[PDB]
Scaffold this active site. Sequence first.
Site, PDB file in Angstrom:
ATOM      1  N   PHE A  69     -12.536   8.484  -0.174  1.00 47.19           N
ATOM      2  CA  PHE A  69     -13.948   8.754  -0.378  1.00 47.19           C
ATOM      3  C   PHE A  69     -14.168   9.346  -1.779  1.00 47.19           C
ATOM      4  CE2 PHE A  69     -17.795  11.340  -0.329  1.00 47.19           C
ATOM      5  CZ  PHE A  69     -18.693  10.322  -0.177  1.00 47.19           C
ATOM      6  N   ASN A 116     -11.590  -2.778   3.422  1.00 46.16           N
ATOM      7  CA  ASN A 116     -11.480  -2.571   1.966  1.00 46.16           C
ATOM      8  C   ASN A 116     -10.198  -3.052   1.368  1.00 46.16           C
ATOM      9  OD1 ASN A 116      -9.673  -0.286   0.666  1.00 46.16           O
ATOM     10  ND2 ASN A 116     -10.078   0.258   2.811  1.00 46.16           N
ATOM     11  N   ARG A 117     -10.327  -3.513   0.108  1.00 47.85           N
ATOM     12  CA  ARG A 117      -9.153  -3.875  -0.717  1.00 47.85           C
ATOM     13  C   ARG A 117      -9.433  -3.328  -2.123  1.00 47.85           C
ATOM     14  NH1 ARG A 117     -11.107  -9.313   0.421  1.00 47.85           N
ATOM     15  NH2 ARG A 117     -12.249 -10.231  -1.276  1.00 47.85           N
ATOM     16  N   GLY A 119      -7.596  -1.434  -3.956  1.00 44.72           N
ATOM     17  CA  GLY A 119      -6.381  -1.557  -4.774  1.00 44.72           C
ATOM     18  C   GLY A 119      -6.088  -0.362  -5.665  1.00 44.72           C
ATOM     19  N   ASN A 183       1.423   8.619  -0.005  1.00 44.58           N
ATOM     20  CA  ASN A 183       0.790   7.516   0.638  1.00 44.58           C
ATOM     21  C   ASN A 183       1.666   6.356   0.464  1.00 44.58           C
ATOM     22  OD1 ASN A 183      -0.862   5.693   1.711  1.00 44.58           O
ATOM     23  ND2 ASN A 183      -2.338   5.619  -0.005  1.00 44.58           N
ATOM     24  N   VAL A 184       2.390   5.970   1.507  1.00 42.86           N
ATOM     25  CA  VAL A 184       3.207   4.775   1.372  1.00 42.86           C
ATOM     26  C   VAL A 184       2.744   3.730   2.392  1.00 42.86           C
ATOM     27  CG1 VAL A 184       5.281   6.025   0.765  1.00 42.86           C
ATOM     28  CG2 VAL A 184       4.563   5.604   3.138  1.00 42.86           C
ATOM     29  N   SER A 186      -0.927   2.256   1.888  1.00 39.44           N
ATOM     30  CA  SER A 186      -1.977   1.299   1.519  1.00 39.44           C
ATOM     31  C   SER A 186      -1.614  -0.150   1.860  1.00 39.44           C
ATOM     32  CB  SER A 186      -2.243   1.346   0.019  1.00 39.44           C
ATOM     33  OG  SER A 186      -3.270   0.454  -0.246  1.00 39.44           O
ATOM     34  N   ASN A 188      -3.033  -2.504   0.354  1.00 45.04           N
ATOM     35  CA  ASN A 188      -3.612  -3.218  -0.836  1.00 45.04           C
ATOM     36  C   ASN A 188      -2.870  -3.045  -2.134  1.00 45.04           C
ATOM     37  OD1 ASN A 188      -5.746  -4.056   0.839  1.00 45.04           O
ATOM     38  ND2 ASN A 188      -6.588  -1.926   0.675  1.00 45.04           N
ATOM     39  N   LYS A 226       1.901   9.783   4.867  1.00 45.29           N
ATOM     40  CA  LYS A 226       0.800   9.065   5.550  1.00 45.29           C
ATOM     41  C   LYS A 226       1.313   7.635   5.859  1.00 45.29           C
ATOM     42  CE  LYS A 226      -4.109   7.898   5.252  1.00 45.29           C
ATOM     43  NZ  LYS A 226      -5.311   8.134   4.413  1.00 45.29           N
ATOM     44  N   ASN A 255      -3.395   5.403   8.202  1.00 43.20           N
ATOM     45  CA  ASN A 255      -4.109   4.614   7.195  1.00 43.20           C
ATOM     46  C   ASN A 255      -4.833   3.454   7.922  1.00 43.20           C
ATOM     47  OD1 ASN A 255      -4.885   3.490   4.604  1.00 43.20           O
ATOM     48  ND2 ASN A 255      -3.071   4.537   3.755  1.00 43.20           N
ATOM     49  N   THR A 328     -14.916   6.425   7.720  1.00 46.96           N
ATOM     50  CA  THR A 328     -15.841   5.327   8.018  1.00 46.96           C
ATOM     51  C   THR A 328     -17.076   5.796   8.782  1.00 46.96           C
ATOM     52  OG1 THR A 328     -14.048   3.729   7.907  1.00 46.96           O
ATOM     53  CG2 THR A 328     -16.000   3.083   9.069  1.00 46.96           C
TER      54      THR A 328
HETATM   55  C1  LIG Z   1     -13.194   2.435   1.403  1.00 42.40           C
HETATM   56  C2  LIG Z   1     -11.849   3.063   1.798  1.00 42.40           C
HETATM   57  C3  LIG Z   1     -10.963   3.451   0.834  1.00 42.40           C
HETATM   58  C4  LIG Z   1      -9.782   4.114   1.178  1.00 42.40           C
HETATM   59  N1  LIG Z   1      -8.860   4.469   0.196  1.00 42.40           N
HETATM   60  C5  LIG Z   1      -7.800   5.262   0.553  1.00 42.40           C
HETATM   61  C6  LIG Z   1      -6.872   5.816  -0.431  1.00 42.40           C
HETATM   62  O1  LIG Z   1      -7.111   5.704  -1.651  1.00 42.40           O
HETATM   63  N2  LIG Z   1      -5.800   6.462   0.060  1.00 42.40           N
HETATM   64  C7  LIG Z   1      -5.500   6.612   1.349  1.00 42.40           C
HETATM   65  O2  LIG Z   1      -4.467   7.207   1.730  1.00 42.40           O
HETATM   66  N3  LIG Z   1      -6.302   6.144   2.334  1.00 42.40           N
HETATM   67  C8  LIG Z   1      -7.429   5.449   1.936  1.00 42.40           C
HETATM   68  N4  LIG Z   1      -8.307   4.997   2.936  1.00 42.40           N
HETATM   69  C9  LIG Z   1      -7.936   5.231   4.335  1.00 42.40           C
HETATM   70  C10 LIG Z   1      -8.629   6.419   4.976  1.00 42.40           C
HETATM   71  O3  LIG Z   1      -8.123   7.599   4.359  1.00 42.40           O
HETATM   72  C11 LIG Z   1      -8.349   6.506   6.465  1.00 42.40           C
HETATM   73  O4  LIG Z   1      -6.918   6.651   6.676  1.00 42.40           O
HETATM   74  C12 LIG Z   1      -8.843   5.287   7.260  1.00 42.40           C
HETATM   75  O5  LIG Z   1     -10.026   4.712   6.686  1.00 42.40           O
HETATM   76  C13 LIG Z   1      -9.038   5.570   8.748  1.00 42.40           C
HETATM   77  O6  LIG Z   1     -10.047   6.546   8.969  1.00 42.40           O
HETATM   78  P1  LIG Z   1     -11.580   6.099   9.321  1.00 42.40           P
HETATM   79  O7  LIG Z   1     -11.488   5.094  10.450  1.00 42.40           O
HETATM   80  O8  LIG Z   1     -12.227   7.382   9.780  1.00 42.40           O
HETATM   81  O9  LIG Z   1     -12.229   5.550   8.004  1.00 42.40           O
HETATM   82  C14 LIG Z   1      -9.501   4.350   2.569  1.00 42.40           C
HETATM   83  C15 LIG Z   1     -10.422   4.004   3.551  1.00 42.40           C
HETATM   84  C16 LIG Z   1     -11.593   3.372   3.164  1.00 42.40           C
HETATM   85  C17 LIG Z   1     -12.565   2.997   4.260  1.00 42.40           C
HETATM   86  O1  LIG Z   2     -22.303   3.488   2.972  1.00 45.24           O
HETATM   87  C1  LIG Z   2     -21.895   4.457   2.304  1.00 45.24           C
HETATM   88  N1  LIG Z   2     -22.523   5.521   2.050  1.00 45.24           N
HETATM   89  C2  LIG Z   2     -23.757   5.932   2.738  1.00 45.24           C
HETATM   90  C3  LIG Z   2     -24.943   5.342   1.967  1.00 45.24           C
HETATM   91  C4  LIG Z   2     -25.339   6.099   0.717  1.00 45.24           C
HETATM   92  C5  LIG Z   2     -25.699   7.539   0.961  1.00 45.24           C
HETATM   93  C6  LIG Z   2     -24.738   8.157   1.922  1.00 45.24           C
HETATM   94  C7  LIG Z   2     -23.891   7.383   2.724  1.00 45.24           C
HETATM   95  C8  LIG Z   2     -23.087   8.271   3.484  1.00 45.24           C
HETATM   96  N2  LIG Z   2     -23.454   9.550   3.156  1.00 45.24           N
HETATM   97  N3  LIG Z   2     -24.461   9.401   2.238  1.00 45.24           N
HETATM   98  C9  LIG Z   2     -25.028  10.515   1.709  1.00 45.24           C
HETATM   99  C10 LIG Z   2     -24.301  11.436   0.996  1.00 45.24           C
HETATM  100  C11 LIG Z   2     -24.902  12.612   0.456  1.00 45.24           C
HETATM  101  C12 LIG Z   2     -26.250  12.844   0.645  1.00 45.24           C
HETATM  102  C13 LIG Z   2     -26.983  11.948   1.335  1.00 45.24           C
HETATM  103  C14 LIG Z   2     -26.403  10.818   1.861  1.00 45.24           C
HETATM  104  F1  LIG Z   2     -27.079   9.929   2.588  1.00 45.24           F
HETATM  105  C15 LIG Z   2     -20.494   4.414   1.883  1.00 45.24           C
HETATM  106  O2  LIG Z   2     -19.969   5.536   1.349  1.00 45.24           O
HETATM  107  N4  LIG Z   2     -18.556   5.281   1.137  1.00 45.24           N
HETATM  108  C16 LIG Z   2     -18.339   4.000   1.418  1.00 45.24           C
HETATM  109  C17 LIG Z   2     -17.095   3.251   1.324  1.00 45.24           C
HETATM  110  C18 LIG Z   2     -17.130   1.958   1.990  1.00 45.24           C
HETATM  111  C19 LIG Z   2     -18.354   1.281   2.471  1.00 45.24           C
HETATM  112  C20 LIG Z   2     -19.676   2.008   2.450  1.00 45.24           C
HETATM  113  C21 LIG Z   2     -19.536   3.391   1.953  1.00 45.24           C
HETATM  114  O1  LIG Z   3      -4.215   3.842   1.115  1.00 43.37           O
HETATM  115  C1  LIG Z   3      -5.228   3.105   1.067  1.00 43.37           C
HETATM  116  C2  LIG Z   3      -5.682   2.657  -0.261  1.00 43.37           C
HETATM  117  C3  LIG Z   3      -6.888   1.835  -0.345  1.00 43.37           C
HETATM  118  C4  LIG Z   3      -7.129   1.033  -1.546  1.00 43.37           C
HETATM  119  O2  LIG Z   3      -7.241  -0.218  -1.416  1.00 43.37           O
HETATM  120  O3  LIG Z   3      -7.312   1.715  -2.559  1.00 43.37           O
HETATM  121  N1  LIG Z   3      -7.247   1.296   0.891  1.00 43.37           N
HETATM  122  C5  LIG Z   3      -6.831   1.735   2.071  1.00 43.37           C
HETATM  123  O4  LIG Z   3      -7.332   1.305   3.065  1.00 43.37           O
HETATM  124  N2  LIG Z   3      -5.842   2.645   2.158  1.00 43.37           N
END
Ligand SMILES: Cc1cc2nc3c(=O)[nH]c(=O)nc-3n(C[C@H](O)[C@H](O)[C@H](O)COP(=O)(O)O)c2cc1C
Ligand SMILES: O=C(N[C@@H]1CCCc2c1cnn2-c1ccccc1F)c1onc2ccccc12
Ligand SMILES: O=C1C[C@@H](C(=O)O)NC(=O)N1
Length: 367
Positions: A69, A116-117, A119, A183-184, A186, A188, A226, A255, A328
């Site tokens: 995030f 997500n990807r 990367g 973090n081993v 990802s 992506n 992780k 992850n 999420t």
């Molecule tokens: C958009 C996105 C980007 C993420 N990037 C990272 C990352 O950089 N490093 C990491 O360890 N996990 C990353 N994650 C994984 C989250 O930390 C988490 O392990 C995973 O999304 C499951 O939790 P959730 O279902 O509550 O999102 C990412 C997840 C999302 C959705």
């Molecule tokens: O939809 C996302 N954000 C929503 C929309 C914008 C505003 C917002 C979100 C979640 N809190 N918030 C928010 C944060 C602070 C103050 C007011 C807010 F309303 C989003 O944020 N991170 C992402 C990563 C993957 C896909 C979508 C992702």
């Molecule tokens: O550890 C990670 C990294 C990330 C990315 O694509 O940056 N996406 C993930 O879902 N997990």
Amino acid sequence: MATGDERFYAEHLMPTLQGLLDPESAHRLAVRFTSLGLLPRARFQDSDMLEVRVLGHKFRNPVGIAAGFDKHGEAVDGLYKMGFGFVEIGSVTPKPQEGNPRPRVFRLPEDQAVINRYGFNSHGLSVVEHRLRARQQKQAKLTEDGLPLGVNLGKNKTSVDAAEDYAEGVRVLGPLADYLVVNVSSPNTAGLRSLQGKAELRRLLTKVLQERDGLRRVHRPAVLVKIAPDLTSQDKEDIASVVKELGIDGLIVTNTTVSRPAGLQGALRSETGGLSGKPLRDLSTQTIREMYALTQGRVPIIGVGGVSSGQDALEKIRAGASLVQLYTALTFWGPPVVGKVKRELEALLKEQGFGGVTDAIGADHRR
Ligand SMILES: Cc1cc2nc3c(=O)[nH]c(=O)nc-3n(C[C@H](O)[C@H](O)[C@H](O)COP(=O)(O)O)c2cc1C
Ligand SMILES: O=C(N[C@@H]1CCCc2c1cnn2-c1ccccc1F)c1onc2ccccc12
Ligand SMILES: O=C1C[C@@H](C(=O)O)NC(=O)N1
Ligand SMILES: CCCCCCCCCC[N+](C)(C)[O-]
Ligand SMILES: [Cl-]
Ligand SMILES: [Cl-]
Ligand SMILES: [Cl-]
């Protein structure tokens, strides 16, 4: 009542923003607003029932923001303001890198999921170091007050020596972190999850721990690993073994998943990348359960994957997690989700006869 903000977000604001913004833009806007502290009132006051002592630290509540995030450590203070008991930034790579081409993030609204990807798009260690240095003593006070900071370390796409990338991270950001995450897992970055063929996982983690042990005492973080939800039984056994042997401080479970559970409805279900949110929930909870058993309950676990409610949080805690994270769910429900989960979790603890979070950790294994 806080349910006012919760309902307004969930039923009106969030679905409106989902229709106006592409997901990467929405991510960027959420980070920017959070960084500026432009947040609805967090009406929830943490109770003593939610306090957890683990990893050498007090956690005022057990609900964290997962990595990915705040990739670059821009929004940490606003994340505490939002009500998170702990913040994990990253993944941070040694050198800056752009990540994959856009689009690289996809919503699956029908599934309450994301793929997500990214990367490992990262500002890199130096930039993040300087950003955290600018607020280092503010963070020391927050940590002392029960609001710790984690740093999730990644590796660059073109690196020739993964262990060296992680070691660089420990040296640069370790002194600024309460805990580090290797973090081993990802999905992506090519080769990354392979950072578990056993003697090679042991080699990597031995190097990481040696570098951590070389830091001065007040700058010496806990080290967690992780893992993915996609591991074989053999991989899980091997990880448990290595973690015990080396004295790794904890595990983050899990992850995103490269699997595509039967039943996903979203049009974008077959995009490449890691799947998060509701469809990951039970896979993650089951991984927690197995890692807790394999480590005899002696290794703290941060549970993550599909947490959107107090019940989701409690299920992970009872399975073995000492803390949980979410990501999420915030994307769908907005900032009020944080207070919601905490309020719900407190109510469930009471209803199930627990004195606090601590008493519930691993409770399912004792029945
Ligand atoms: C958009 C996105 C980007 C993420 N990037 C990272 C990352 O950089 N490093 C990491 O360890 N996990 C990353 N994650 C994984 C989250 O930390 C988490 O392990 C995973 O999304 C499951 O939790 P959730 O279902 O509550 O999102 C990412 C997840 C999302 C959705
Ligand atoms: O939809 C996302 N954000 C929503 C929309 C914008 C505003 C917002 C979100 C979640 N809190 N918030 C928010 C944060 C602070 C103050 C007011 C807010 F309303 C989003 O944020 N991170 C992402 C990563 C993957 C896909 C979508 C992702
Ligand atoms: O550890 C990670 C990294 C990330 C990315 O694509 O940056 N996406 C993930 O879902 N997990
Ligand atoms: C992304 C658009 C929604 C942003 C919501 C802004 C709420 C800020 C709250 C400020 N206030 C002092 C009234 O609490
Ligand atoms: Cl408000
Ligand atoms: Cl298997
Ligand atoms: Cl399909």
